[PDB]
Swiss-Prot record, chains A, B:
Cofactor(s) named in the record: Mn(2+)
Listed NCBIfam families: NurA_Sulf (NF041033)
Protein name from the UniProt record: DNA double-strand break repair nuclease NurA
Enzyme class: hydrolase
Subunit composition and interactions: Homodimer. Forms a complex with HerA.
Organism, as annotated: Saccharolobus solfataricus (strain ATCC 35092 / DSM 1617 / JCM 11322 / P2)
Key words of the record: DNA damage, DNA repair, DNA-binding, Endonuclease, Exonuclease, Hydrolase, Manganese, Metal-binding, Nuclease
Gene: nurA
GO annotation terms (biological process): DNA repair
Secreted found in the keyword field: no
Length: 319, 319
């Protein structure tokens, strides 16, 4: 780093005060209007799914690894149910990082169908909007390619020649997989995120979730927001509900999306139940799922070493 | 990481063999056709410029830091010339990482104008194509905004309200800055990259630069490729030359773009001169520039700590 930069900082006061003042005069009032304290709490099984992935640009191509885990938790305990993950190589390309992540999302969502029915609720890591992905051109696709979607053939989608088509087929797969989850599990799926760009509530330069963390402290929940978006088409008139909750005094606020109509009572029931498997304001089942699938710097080191050995072993003219 | 995933890898032979053969049967022949050995080498001043940056999503916004450095090097030595860098905060946004990087590119290119004339050649880190950026909508811009471009007012461009306009104004600034560099320094600018997606040469699934690293060992250079792309308009009929060179037996291949026509003799002169400030196949002036501007994990830690103190000190209601 440049020594000059850091000395100089020890300039930015202009932006700090601006943002502070703007925020104070924009919505110190409306926050408390739109927040509901819920301080009292009150046996219920959660299956949590999260995923991890990475890809490193190399000469043989983009060497990647994806993994997802389902985790069952209650009062009595947490244990892993399933693990699902592949290591592999993609050919060089502009959407390689995005294909890797979509492939990861694929495994998560498919574990939601595998083990979802083993609990009362399913906790996914990430928002409904983000898991669904953007709109996809359904016209570059032949009859055969649409089937891969229907039959949930990952090995097949991966085997595609073209790059744009692979990213796009994987996007479709995820939309079809969300759709199955929604129809099988109705309001029992909770899509939870620590981060969000939503402004439905306050309509400011900053996101709502940040607004609530600045101007409320106590355990609670926000005004409910009602949002909209083959079988995929049955997801076009899905209306869902968003709220923001803090499960524990002084801790982070999270976003929850639940497909269906939901009321105060349901929200308080969902908070009370989540609080029983939560640590420091967040559901342990998820934190665990997340921690297990993460690829440490060390994990990455191991993987590359392995792959580079199988190169140097199989191929003789390789440097 | 999921134990299962790594056990399993200790599957992928399918892809490793497939790639290997394809590559062997695609161009083990054409490589040597298109590679020129140049094993013999033969006082010349290089100014290198590189840049570093980062931004961390936080509640106050995206806290970022950019920095660029010019470095003068020859036979006798290397020393830093200028350092140029800012710390700041952006409002939350979808193009915040891109604005940060474009802001970084701005400082690099402006140091190329500052200190470029102090050397015989100027080494930039990165390709011509990438530094120029994509095409920009010149119609959302008023007269006032186009002037900020013309006067090189970073403080002004940063102060804009709207996000799409800021990214787009910064893109323009870079195009205008490259354009000044090209006209003041003609073929004296060498745009060097370790990575590239070019396929002009071999037209394969893998990039050319990877093809040459696999199938040649010795110091040399490739067939020359001739490519195309207010003052920016004077950059639309810029034709430039690309070649790939390895400066040192057994080492990496780099891409060089130089604006102008260039021949074998020039290429061999440029290799010979670069070899004299190069270590293990790469020009030390750049490596140094790059190392100095890099933001270590530790650098990032310090910066955040500082910023978070200036919040908690200035703002009282801040958590
Ligand atoms: Mn995740
Ligand atoms: Mn750089």
């Amino acid at each position: 780093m440049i020594r000059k930069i850091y000395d100089k900082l020890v300039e930015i006061k202009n932006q700090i005060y601006n943002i502070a003042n703007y925020l104070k005069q924009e919505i110190q009032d409306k926050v408390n209007e739109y927040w509901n304290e819920y301080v009292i709490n009150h046996t219920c099984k959660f299956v949590a799914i999260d995923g991890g992935s990475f890809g490193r640009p190399m000469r043989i191509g983009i060497v990647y690894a994806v993994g997802a885990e389902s985790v069952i938790g209650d009062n009595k305990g947490v244990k892993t149910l399933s693990e699902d993950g592949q290591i592999g190589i993609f050919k060089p390309g502009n959407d390689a990082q995005e294909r890797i992540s979509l492939l990861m999302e694929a495994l998560e969502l498919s574990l939601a169908l595998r083990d979802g029915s083993k609990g009362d609720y399913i906790l996914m890591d990430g928002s409904l909007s983000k898991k669904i992905g953007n709109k996809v051109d359904i016209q570059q696709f032949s009859d055969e390619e649409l089937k891969l979607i229907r039959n949930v053939d990952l090995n097949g989608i991966i085997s595609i020649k073209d790059e744009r088509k692979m990213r796009d087929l994987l996007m479709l797969l995820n939309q079809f997989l969300v759709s199955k989850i929604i129809e099988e599990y109705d309001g029992n799926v909770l899509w939870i995120s620590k981060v969000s760009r939503g402004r439905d509530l306050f309509g400011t330069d900053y996101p709502d979730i940040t607004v609530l963390e600045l101007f409320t402290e106590k355990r609670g929940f926000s005004k409910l927001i009602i949002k909209n978006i083959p079988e995929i088409e049955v997801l076009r008139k899905m209306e869902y509900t968003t709220f923001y909750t803090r499960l524990d005094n002084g801790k982070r606020v999270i976003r929850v999306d639940i497909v269906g109509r939901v009321d105060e009572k349901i929200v308080k029931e969902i908070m009370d139940r989540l609080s029983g498997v939560s640590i420091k304001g967040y559901p342990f089942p998820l934190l665990k799922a997340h921690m297990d699938v993460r690829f440490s710097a060390m994990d990455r080191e191991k993987i590359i070493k392995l792959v580079g050995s199988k190169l140097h072993k199989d191929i003789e003219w390789w440097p």
